[PDB]
Amino acid sequence: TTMQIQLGANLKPYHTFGIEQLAAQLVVAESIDDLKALYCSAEWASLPKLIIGKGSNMLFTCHYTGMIVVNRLNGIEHQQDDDYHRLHVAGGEDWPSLVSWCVEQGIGGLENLALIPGCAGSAPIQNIGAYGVEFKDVCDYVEYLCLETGTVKRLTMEECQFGYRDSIFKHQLYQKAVVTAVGLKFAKAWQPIIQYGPLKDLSSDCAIHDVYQRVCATRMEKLPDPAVMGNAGSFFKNPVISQQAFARLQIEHPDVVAYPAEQGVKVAAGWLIDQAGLKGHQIGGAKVHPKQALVIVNTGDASAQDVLMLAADIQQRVFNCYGIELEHEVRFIGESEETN
Numbered sequence: 023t024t025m026q027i028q029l030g031a032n033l034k035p036y037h038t039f040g041i042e043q044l045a046a047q048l049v050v051a052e053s054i055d056d057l058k059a060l061y062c063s064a065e066w067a068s069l070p071k072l073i074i075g076k077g078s079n080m081l082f083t084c085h086y087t088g089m090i091v092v093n094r095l096n097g098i099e100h101q102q103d104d105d106y107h108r109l110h111v112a113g114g115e116d117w118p119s120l121v122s123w124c125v126e127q128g129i130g131g132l133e134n135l136a137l138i139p140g141c142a143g144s145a146p147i148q149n150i151g152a153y154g155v156e157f158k159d160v161c162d163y164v165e166y167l168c169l170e171t172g173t174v175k176r177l178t179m180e181e182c183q184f185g186y187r188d189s190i191f192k193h194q195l196y197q198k199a200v201v202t203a204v205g206l207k208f209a210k211a212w213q214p215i216i217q218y219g220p221l222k223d224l225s226s227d228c229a230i231h232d233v234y235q236r237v238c239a240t241r242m243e244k245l246p247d248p249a250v251m252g253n254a255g256s257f258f259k260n261p262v263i264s265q266q267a268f269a270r271l272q273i274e275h276p277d278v279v280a281y282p283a284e285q286g287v288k289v290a291a292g293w294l295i296d297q298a299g300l301k302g303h304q305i306g307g308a309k310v311h312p313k314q315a316l317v318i319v320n321t322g323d324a325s326a327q328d329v330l331m332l333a334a335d336i337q338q339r340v341f342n343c344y345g346i347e348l349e350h351e352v353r354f355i356g357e358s359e360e361t362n
């Protein structure tokens with residue numbers, strides 16, 4: 023009963039905003055061969071296709087008239103050096119589950135990425151990061167179905183061109199590549215990364231588990247669970263501006279919060295939105311969550327239009343207070359593929 027095409031499928035079960043909407047067609051892929059039949063064959067060559075993991079970084083903005091392809095390729099294989107653990111993770115694997123698995127195996131280095139919703143295959147697309155770690159830091163390689171050849175190719179971590187919330191799959195490989203698996207590499211001499219938020223209370227000889235527990239604890243405290251109130255996480259990226267640009271900003275706003283970046287300064291958008299006095303602001307069913315002001319939440323009856331107008335309102339207010347232009351991180355889906 024696999025590779026059954028669902029016609030007129032409701033999308034709420036398929037993305038974390040949980041907004042009422044449907045897809046002309048939807049199918050669950052479960053193997054490399056399914057993706058190969060779906061993307062590199064005459065059958066279903068008719069429909070535009072959107073590959074999704076958990077839809078935890080997505081907003082459907084109208085009736086989706088293509089075929090949604092739900093990535094559920096499973097498998098975790100493990101091996102180890104004298105020096106490293108290496109995992110080969112199928113792209114459909116659930117990410118919060120994978121980090122819990124590493125932690126329970128005693129595999130150190132993934133724990134700052136605890137509870138980020140999504141599939142392992144989506145992790146490289148926006149180079150997920152939290153608590154001072156990013157996917158590029160643990161990445162050995164990425165494998166993908168090459169839409170031009172119908173064969174699986176491999177990129178080293180270098181060839182992925184990772185940046186803040188960025189990679190080659192949002193550029194050259196955009197719509198040309200379906201990630202089928204991720205190679206993760208972790209030093210056996212584990213080093214806690216412990217400089218962010220409540221991890222600062224930890225000490226540098228703590229255990230993997232200590233770090234993981236703290237991350238889970240804080241996240242479950244600050245971020246709404248989307249099965250309770252729909253959301254897509256931090257709606258905007260932290261804007262990255264020059265040093266000089268930052269110093270200028272900081273003359274009028276000496277209080278402004280910054281995060282490290284190699285090129286220029288990354289400014290905390292949470293802080294910008296909060297000082298702009300936007301916490302709790304609602305349009306229709308969409309609201310700025312007061313405990314983490316980057317997260318637009320669905321209070322129950324949001325439309326995509328609500329979310330989009332609230333985003334526009336925040337962006338407007340932020341640009342006025344600070345002359346800074348926030349860039350949305352959530353992908354906006356139209357009839358077929360992304361818009362604006």
Ligand SMILES: Cc1cc2nc3c(=O)[nH]c(=O)nc-3n(C[C@H](O)[C@H](O)[C@H](O)COP(=O)(O)OP(=O)(O)OC[C@H]3O[C@@H](n4cnc5c(N)ncnc54)[C@H](O)[C@@H]3O)c2cc1C
Nearest residue numbers: 074075076077078079140141143144150151200201254255
């Ligand atoms: C409560 C919550 C907290 C969050 N916290 C964080 C955080 O701390 N850090 C962070 O970086 N993100 C965070 N996010 C955002 C999100 O979890 C990540 O962006 C995640 O990587 C998206 O995974 P997904 O499987 O849902 O991708 P989706 O939303 O399904 O898809 C995202 C994009 O990737 C493309 N895509 C999906 N799968 C493939 C594939 N196999 N091959 C090629 N392209 C693909 C899609 O077409 C779409 O363009 C959070 C989200 C939520 C809801």
